[model samples]
Target: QITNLGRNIENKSFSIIDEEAGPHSFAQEEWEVVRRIIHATADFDYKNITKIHPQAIDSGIQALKKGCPIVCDVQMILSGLNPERLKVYGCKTYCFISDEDVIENAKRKNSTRAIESIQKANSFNLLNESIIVIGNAPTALLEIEKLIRQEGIKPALIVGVPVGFVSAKESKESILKLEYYNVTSIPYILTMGRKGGSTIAVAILHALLLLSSKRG
Candidate 1:
């Protein structure tokens, strides 16, 4: 006999989320990702708090299908990512915060290693085809915003969800205000305010990956 324990729990969870998610409006593709995010975190607040660019989902799914690298701000973000799901698309996650070069650069510049990691990513030419996930550090997202303007380094999609009371909301606001904001332009998925972290970031990406697999 097939066990229905997992399926039963999942179905119950979805029912709860659907009830609490309220009358939020999202397209089919957007709702798919949003539903998964709420399911993963059990945080239906995302129904109102999550701010995903109109094109972010499609851009992210396409980039993952192409096996683009995922650049993460911290090890927690990298480690929390679902490697098995990513492996289906031959994608890899990278975190340079602990790299020797990043350490040296951070010390020399008197900046956080998270900020240095963004610079290091530039050296590897990972920005163009990369999915940047900044979950634990606002400095990293701030640096990425700077690079996006100063260097014109546009990644496929940026998941900026650093959690803190300091610059968390500021950094996300900056990314959304980028000059080229459109479906064909650089896209991002951000959790508004200071209610985000590595887990939330991974949840969003994992949802995207799952959505992509379904399409395949």
Candidate 2:
């Protein structure tokens, strides 16, 4: 019965077809390799990291529902999950970005600026905070860890969801850095070179909510 349903959906589905080499391609493979190398280097420095696909917003949401404060920094703002909605739940959140200059001048813009934001956000008082999400930037993890130690907040979870251009590599590096710090975190990288969106965030949040409710 399940096989029949799966076959039916596979046959009838009309999902978006990628114009850029049809999903995973040589380009993605190359990026993954570069990202891995960067991660190894960042790990030596001791950091907190996360990676999020532009299309996987749900995964982020699920991380949030795990019941801690959430700090999100996206290169581009998220659509469905706005700050107002998150704040309503009394969830602590912080976000920062460069004012065009950082994007145009920096050699590794995402990594440099993201690192800046992470450091800034981690300075907050968020003992109750649970998750941190980053989009289009991974360097943020390096500084986030520094802040965590200074603030004395023990984070339960974190995610790095940097998409677009070369930011993915930085995201991977950020993840490795976080692992080095022994911070509890989850890194949900995009499939190959794919980016994520609001759907991923919502899916993640829903999953977290379900899991928590079940426990209760």
Candidate 3:
């Protein structure tokens, strides 16, 4: 079964499709359940907020209240912001520091800003254990997988949620490599349009939670 929606931000069509062996089965009305929840909580009037990772914490807090746990992979956790905020929300959080080599390569490839920002990003994975290394660089993805394996870890899910001008394709490709390695994942194969905020994350999490809870 599939819930076909119009083309979303990616300009490619999107749907909530069922995988045959998955634990949850969506009834015909399942999308309605999701629609109702979105209508009930989303605030459309708010300005488009840039750097909304902080707000993602707020949304995760709300999700946790509904018994959902959020796992995030970021560059770092400076100033204790992530840990403190995550604690307030009563949710488990994790972050992974992107390898510096990833940035250096971007610079060599003429992506100066990508290198700079990634450099500023923290190289710490502190979100309890869930992570998705977003990038297409085969070497980088392999390195991340190696690190993950060395930690005796396995990701419950992975996403190719890359945005911006550089390395976005690399991020998506990396996600595919994860799947090739038999990693279970749900990647966002799109670039950043307007709605790339907590809304999408919350929406995706809702879907995942509903399916997981039902499976349990």
Which prediction has more favorable TM-score, 1 or 3? 1
Error of 3 at 209 (Å): 2.7
What do the candidate models score in CA lDDT, each in turn?
A: 0.84, 0.44, 0.35
Q: Flag clash pairs in model 1.
A: none
lDDT of 1 by residue, 1-216 (tens): 136998898778878887778798888777776787788677887788788888798899999999999999889877777677778788878899999989998999999999999899888898886899998899999998888888888799999989899999899888877844632367888888887888888888877876887787
lDDT of 2 by residue, 1-216 (tens): 249888675334312112222333224323332233233232211111223433233443444555346665663434435555455345555455553544443435444656655554544554234566554453554455455545555555544444455545544555455556756343344322324333433334433443344445
RMSD of each: 2.5, 11.3, 12.2
Candidate closest to the true structure, highest lDDT: 1
Model 2, which residues run further than 4 Å from truth?
1-67, 75-79, 82-89, 98-113, 127-129, 145-153, 177-199, 214-216
Reference-based lDDT, residue 201, model 1: 85
Show model 1 residue runs off by greater than 4 Å.
Answer: 1-3, 179-184
Q: What lDDT score is found at residue 163 in candidate 1?
A: 89
Lowest lDDT block of 10, candidate 3:
45-54
